[PDB]
Design an enzyme around this catalytic site. Sequence first.
Site, short mmCIF file in Angstrom:
data_model
loop_
_atom_site.label_atom_id
_atom_site.label_comp_id
_atom_site.label_asym_id
_atom_site.label_seq_id
_atom_site.Cartn_x
_atom_site.Cartn_y
_atom_site.Cartn_z
N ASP A 170 29.60 12.68 -16.16
CA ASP A 170 28.35 12.05 -16.58
C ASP A 170 27.30 13.12 -16.26
O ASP A 170 27.55 14.00 -15.44
CB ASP A 170 28.10 10.79 -15.75
CG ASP A 170 26.69 10.23 -15.95
OD1 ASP A 170 26.30 9.96 -17.10
OD2 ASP A 170 25.98 10.05 -14.94
N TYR A 171 26.14 13.04 -16.89
CA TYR A 171 25.09 14.03 -16.65
C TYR A 171 24.02 13.54 -15.66
O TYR A 171 23.97 13.99 -14.51
CB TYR A 171 24.43 14.42 -17.98
CG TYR A 171 23.53 15.63 -17.88
CD1 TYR A 171 24.05 16.90 -17.65
CD2 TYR A 171 22.14 15.51 -18.01
CE1 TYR A 171 23.23 18.02 -17.53
CE2 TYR A 171 21.30 16.63 -17.89
CZ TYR A 171 21.86 17.88 -17.65
OH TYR A 171 21.04 18.99 -17.53
N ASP A 172 23.16 12.63 -16.11
CA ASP A 172 22.09 12.12 -15.26
C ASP A 172 22.59 11.37 -14.03
O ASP A 172 23.38 10.44 -14.14
CB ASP A 172 21.15 11.24 -16.06
CG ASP A 172 20.50 11.99 -17.20
OD1 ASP A 172 19.73 12.94 -16.92
OD2 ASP A 172 20.77 11.65 -18.36
MG MG Z 1 24.36 8.75 -14.79
NA NA Z 2 17.87 13.09 -15.02
#
Ligand code: MG
Ligand code: NA
Length: 229
Positions: free
Chosen positions: A6-8
């Site tokens: 996942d990124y954020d």
């Molecule tokens: Mg996230």
């Molecule tokens: Na972010």
Amino acid sequence: SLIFLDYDGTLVPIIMNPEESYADAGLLSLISDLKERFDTYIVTGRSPEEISRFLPLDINMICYHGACSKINGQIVYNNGSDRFLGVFDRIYEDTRSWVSDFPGLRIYRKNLAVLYHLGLMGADMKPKLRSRIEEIARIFGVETYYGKMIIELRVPGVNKGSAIRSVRGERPAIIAGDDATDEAAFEANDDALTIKVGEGETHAKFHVADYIEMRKILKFIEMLGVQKK
Ligand SMILES: [Mg+2]
Ligand code: NA
Ligand code: NA
């Protein structure tokens, strides 16, 4: 093998200004190295245009929680999501003026989603705004997602877990995430090496404190490969 990240909140911290979440040199180096040894996928609710500029590396991605993927550079719409391109254009056009109706409200336009950020907005008019968003959702036949200080209109039925499952099948994989959508992804891929980032109850096999520790784990996996060969 496979790694889905996942990124954020997983590779980068959650911040008040989500448009600024570009990967720093440290993350660029880590992922650059990692993708050389593992088939790496960024799995996010962000669009391909966002991840592509945030993390301009040669990696695959599952965006919009699965509505669209970018594989080998190709923008691949999944589940006929491209049928919604005209819809989100209209949604933005009809709701962009709300930034003045609700001072502080921020609207992030994307090809397959419109994200309303209530972070800088006053408390009093949030119930009203919420009802307006839900009305737009019913009118256009789209789906509403409620997050932290966030309300997003997206393609009905998107699911990180299903998208990941579809790619890996039964193959061995690592899956890392920080919120409920990732928790659900772990559930749909419980046979994988699931990694939870951040506080909260979880069913992940491994748990780390924040994106900093998460990066450290990825850093370590890389060093393992260097010795392994
Ligand atoms: Mg996230
Ligand atoms: Na972010
Ligand atoms: Na974090």
